[PDB]
Write a protein that holds these residues in place. Sequence first.
Motif, PDB file in Angstrom:
ATOM      1  N   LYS A 190     -11.025  -0.701  -3.619  1.00 54.66           N
ATOM      2  CA  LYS A 190     -12.511  -0.713  -3.194  1.00 54.66           C
ATOM      3  C   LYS A 190     -12.692   1.317  -2.693  1.00 54.66           C
ATOM      4  CE  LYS A 190     -15.201  -3.839  -2.599  1.00 54.66           C
ATOM      5  NZ  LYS A 190     -15.676  -3.781  -0.656  1.00 54.66           N
ATOM      6  N   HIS A 191     -11.416   2.229  -2.307  1.00 53.38           N
ATOM      7  CA  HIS A 191     -11.559   3.113  -2.236  1.00 53.38           C
ATOM      8  C   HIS A 191     -11.040   3.827  -4.078  1.00 53.38           C
ATOM      9  CE1 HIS A 191     -10.645   7.098  -0.297  1.00 53.38           C
ATOM     10  NE2 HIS A 191      -9.593   7.274  -1.520  1.00 53.38           N
ATOM     11  N   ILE A 228       0.466  -1.221   0.118  1.00 52.29           N
ATOM     12  CA  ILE A 228       0.051  -0.096   0.231  1.00 52.29           C
ATOM     13  C   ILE A 228       0.957   1.083   0.038  1.00 52.29           C
ATOM     14  CG2 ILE A 228      -1.783   1.412   1.293  1.00 52.29           C
ATOM     15  CD1 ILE A 228      -1.353  -2.157   1.987  1.00 52.29           C
ATOM     16  N   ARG A 229       2.393   1.287   0.199  1.00 50.57           N
ATOM     17  CA  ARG A 229       3.131   2.213   0.739  1.00 50.57           C
ATOM     18  C   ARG A 229       3.496   2.501  -0.448  1.00 50.57           C
ATOM     19  NH1 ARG A 229       4.172   0.817   6.007  1.00 50.57           N
ATOM     20  NH2 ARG A 229       5.908  -0.620   5.709  1.00 50.57           N
ATOM     21  N   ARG A 230       3.797   1.635  -1.550  1.00 54.02           N
ATOM     22  CA  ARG A 230       4.196   2.021  -2.986  1.00 54.02           C
ATOM     23  C   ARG A 230       3.105   2.334  -3.255  1.00 54.02           C
ATOM     24  NH1 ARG A 230       6.425  -3.240  -5.106  1.00 54.02           N
ATOM     25  NH2 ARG A 230       7.601  -2.266  -6.695  1.00 54.02           N
ATOM     26  N   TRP A 257       0.586   5.501  -6.964  1.00 56.86           N
ATOM     27  CA  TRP A 257      -1.251   6.340  -6.742  1.00 56.86           C
ATOM     28  C   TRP A 257      -1.457   7.526  -6.147  1.00 56.86           C
ATOM     29  CZ3 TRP A 257      -4.678   2.303  -8.999  1.00 56.86           C
ATOM     30  CH2 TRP A 257      -4.271   0.864  -8.877  1.00 56.86           C
ATOM     31  N   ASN A 258       0.024   7.834  -5.523  1.00 52.13           N
ATOM     32  CA  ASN A 258      -0.851   9.075  -5.205  1.00 52.13           C
ATOM     33  C   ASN A 258      -1.779   9.151  -3.752  1.00 52.13           C
ATOM     34  OD1 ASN A 258       2.235  10.321  -4.812  1.00 52.13           O
ATOM     35  ND2 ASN A 258       1.411  11.770  -7.331  1.00 52.13           N
ATOM     36  N   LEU A 259      -2.070   8.384  -3.147  1.00 54.28           N
ATOM     37  CA  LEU A 259      -3.227   8.229  -2.585  1.00 54.28           C
ATOM     38  C   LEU A 259      -2.801   8.873  -0.908  1.00 54.28           C
ATOM     39  CD1 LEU A 259      -5.856   5.176  -3.460  1.00 54.28           C
ATOM     40  CD2 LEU A 259      -5.889   7.690  -3.536  1.00 54.28           C
TER      41      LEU A 259
END
Length: 47
Positions: free
Chosen positions: A42-43, A12-14, A19-21
């Motif tokens: 999902k988000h 998720i960090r990568r 993805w700049n989330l």
Amino acid sequence: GSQNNDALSPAIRRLLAEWNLDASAIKGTGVGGRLTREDVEKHLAKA
């Protein structure tokens, strides 16, 4: 202070970087306060 435990995993960090989330703006459920690949995907569709 605030730095100690991340609310995301390595994947998720990568993803977050490419993805700049913002995890803070994403709901999850890993260990009380974490978003997983399923929560990001999902988000990812939500917005």
